[PDB]
Design a protein around this ligand. Sequence first.
Ligand SMILES: Nc1nc2c(ncn2[C@@H]2O[C@H](COP(=O)(O)OP(=O)(O)OP(=O)(O)O)[C@@H](O)[C@H]2O)c(=O)[nH]1
Ligand SMILES: [Zn+2]
Lengths: 346, 49, 49, 192, 96, 48, 193
Amino acid sequence: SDPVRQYLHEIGQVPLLTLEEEVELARKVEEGMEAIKKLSEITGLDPDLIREVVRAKILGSARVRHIPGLKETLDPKTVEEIDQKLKSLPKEHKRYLHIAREGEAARQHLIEANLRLVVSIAKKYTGRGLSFLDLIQEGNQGLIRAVEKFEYKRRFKFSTYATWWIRQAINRAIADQARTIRIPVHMVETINKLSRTARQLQQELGREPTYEEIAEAMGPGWDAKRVEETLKIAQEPVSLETPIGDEKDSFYGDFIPDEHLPSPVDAATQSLLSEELEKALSKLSEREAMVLKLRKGLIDGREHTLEEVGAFFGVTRERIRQIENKALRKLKYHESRTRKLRDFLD
Amino acid sequence: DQFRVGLARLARGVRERMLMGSEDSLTPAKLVNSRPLEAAIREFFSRSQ
Amino acid sequence: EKARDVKDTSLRVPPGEGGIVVRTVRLRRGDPGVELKPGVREVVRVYVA
Amino acid sequence: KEVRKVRIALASPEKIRSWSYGEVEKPETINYRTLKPERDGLFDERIFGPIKDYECACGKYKRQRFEGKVCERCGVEVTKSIVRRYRMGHIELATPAAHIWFVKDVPSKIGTLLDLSATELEQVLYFSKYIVLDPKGAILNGVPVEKRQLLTDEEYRELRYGKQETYPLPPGVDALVKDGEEVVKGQELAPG
Amino acid sequence: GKAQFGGQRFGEMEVWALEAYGAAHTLQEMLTLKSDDIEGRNAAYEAIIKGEDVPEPSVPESFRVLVKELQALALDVQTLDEKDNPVDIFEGLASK
Amino acid sequence: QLIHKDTGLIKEDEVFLGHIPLMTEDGSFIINGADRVIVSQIHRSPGV
Amino acid sequence: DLVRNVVRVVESYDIDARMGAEAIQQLLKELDLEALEKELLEEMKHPSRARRAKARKRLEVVRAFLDSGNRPEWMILEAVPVLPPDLRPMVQVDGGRFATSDLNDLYRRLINRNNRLKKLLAQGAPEIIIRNEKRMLQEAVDALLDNGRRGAPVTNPGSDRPLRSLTDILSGKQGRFRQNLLGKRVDYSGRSV
DNA sequence: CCTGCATCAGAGCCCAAAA
DNA sequence: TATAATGGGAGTCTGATGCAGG
RNA sequence: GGGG
Ligand SMILES: Nc1nc2c(ncn2[C@@H]2O[C@H](COP(=O)(O)OP(=O)(O)OP(=O)(O)O)[C@@H](O)[C@H]2O)c(=O)[nH]1
Ligand SMILES: [Zn+2]
């Protein structure tokens, strides 16, 4: 009924590995990877395709899907076709198939037996914007990376190598997913640096530092202006549903106007402006209105400058610039009488 | 009461820092992050009912 | 008349309010003693009685 | 035509897709520097419509002479920006998920149809117990497993992976049995 | 609120008042042209400044929000005519 | 004062914890420029 | 066994047993509603009063789906709809600050877990890990549709405020119906002493 | 068969609402 | 990318209805 | 917390 408690119970069902057991599983995974490489040469296939086919039979029919990068939809037909070419190999070649299968099996057990390690690292990273289980799942992702890269020959215990990859995965998770406005991982690193720096500066000075005091402490390249711009970028958004007051009946979003949609006054104004504009180009001449109207466009916006204007106005090409002026000129005289258009300048 | 909460939160930071990064080269000034305490007091005065 | 680069955002007077301007405080960035919240160049306060 | 009636009904996953203008592939919202929407994210204009009236994202086609065109470069339709209130997106789940209204609103609608109690439906949905589609002749604790039976994890592992146990031998003590040997329950393997 | 230049809240009990009087066109104005019916309120203002009478109202925008919110809950809300055929209250904008 | 339970090492320093708001003479506070009051709270006394 | 030169067969079955909404979607698909009506009608002819009572409640749901034309497996989601953006806005307020709707954080949680699930599947993670990921996905869908309904309410970090889900928006005094639908703020109005 | 017993969904309106 | 590190921290009162239990 |  408690999702953390349930998961803790499930990990506790896989016993921890002995030094021997740890080395045994690790050994089988490495040999299996080498087996798949060799199986590629012999067969003329793809090492990844073989690996997904080998892996499919260990986990069972439960998981069958297209894998991003694989050339074949990885449906029961293709895994049977390809598995039958692998089981049709001679005894000395076919020994490598058995190796790959057992490699994958040991990998599963190795991962499962180390899940408690991830919990003990993730619990220390709580409170940074990802839920505990989100931290465990990202931590588990690194553990998978660690199992694939582990070299057992170095005689190191597994826990030593895994921890680097698990710590790496959680920290990348926090940097990627914690913000409504996503920030590049490197930029998040810089922001955190300013925080630590200012926090030191406040501890020696007994008061808040200025932008200038932080810019000095950050070294060359930093002025006060850049510290401020960085802080502006680091601002997290706030919920529209944030309550205002002790009565539970007021939201912040309710105090925010909608600036996009035209207001009744403005919508009214736009209709009235189009109506006076066309009822104005026709009171000189429609044709000198037709030449001018094409040079801007009512609902289109057809302003180039000199080329395009070569085609259909009705004249050749320099002339349209001139009738643009007499249209604009007669409009200008005609405007002083019907000075109703002055007020639309706001 | 709000002060006591803020002090206990700062202690979480102390115990967690007494595990990571070298069990020796730490003074009290580097071990303490005052952010939890400042927020609790600022939280009480600016937003308590 | 070229369409101007800037628009008129001036602070005005709400419906039904108003009086005599008795004081003004102007606070910029880069004046002694004042730093505003990030991004804010200057703050002006007008007290009307 | 005039509205005389309002019907409300369930939506198939096909129909949910019949509404959708695109899949939201990323938790990203808007770009931190440009403040414009992130491509394929929750505000993407390629899915839900243009931010500005009759104007595409990159600005190749900027006015209403084109309505219905989809810009080749940036992918945004030229229409009224009002459509960002109307057009739906969708998320394609990897594994199906139950709609909580039809589970937790009592008596459960799913539960009544399948003759599953409140406790049972919780346990299957929240991954506490297995429910059997095809026993394939399995039998557990002497009785055959029948379809729609609930199994715990331990019960499932015994059925699915077999039963086994490992016994530690005190260091240096040699075993009283040989590798490969069939063994009865209670037989002595080592001094302890 | 006064500081936002707000409108007065005409609430559930106020609608009942208009209903008991049977003033349907007054009530409909409160529910459409004087609030969230966008096509109607823009059109109504234009009519008063031109001396024309205000137009018959259209679909209120907060109902369209309600429809889309039920779709986000995976419920199909369909407006129908007398012949049981679907009626499109989005005027083609949300369909491919 | 830092004490190492393992070693014996002692490093002592005075660390800055931030600011605490002060009450004025008439019993009020100044929080972000605005004068404020803290209202007393009645409740059930601890005990048995 | 390539060392011991033996093929072991460990006693165990090809049994099909599943967890979660995926299992349920199948059982709901494997319902012939016509038959279950027939069965429940035959059971409706029976004493002890309780037998007839339960067959009725069941028969009402069966008949509901039958008349309507709805398939029971639709109560399970494959594609989850996404509400249009202007209804969950991200807007720049006066100060140049951004203010955003709670639905965006609920969707982000969902999208991350879905993406992580796609990745864990392609990389062939163990069943324990895929199981954890799948149940977290249910909880993320559960918070999106009705938050707080089952389990701990999802909150923004460092706040006790439950995030406002689709169900909270529709229902209650502050809900869509009783706030913006049966009553509204209006133009051409004023107030005084 | 009947009764304890829990889990859930209810708890007035409008205005300032000083964030 | 390599000493080893392997199971978490935390908060009233009403009436109606569908449920395991003498 | 304050107005009817
Ligand atoms: N519903 C409601 N009404 C309120 C509230 N506060 C004030 N009122 C109004 O306050 C009024 C009280 O009026 P009274 O002056 O006590 O009326 P009365 O019966 O003549 O009493 P006297 O004037 O002393 O004779 C009622 O009419 C209410 O409508 C409130 O919070 N809720
Ligand atoms: Zn474009």
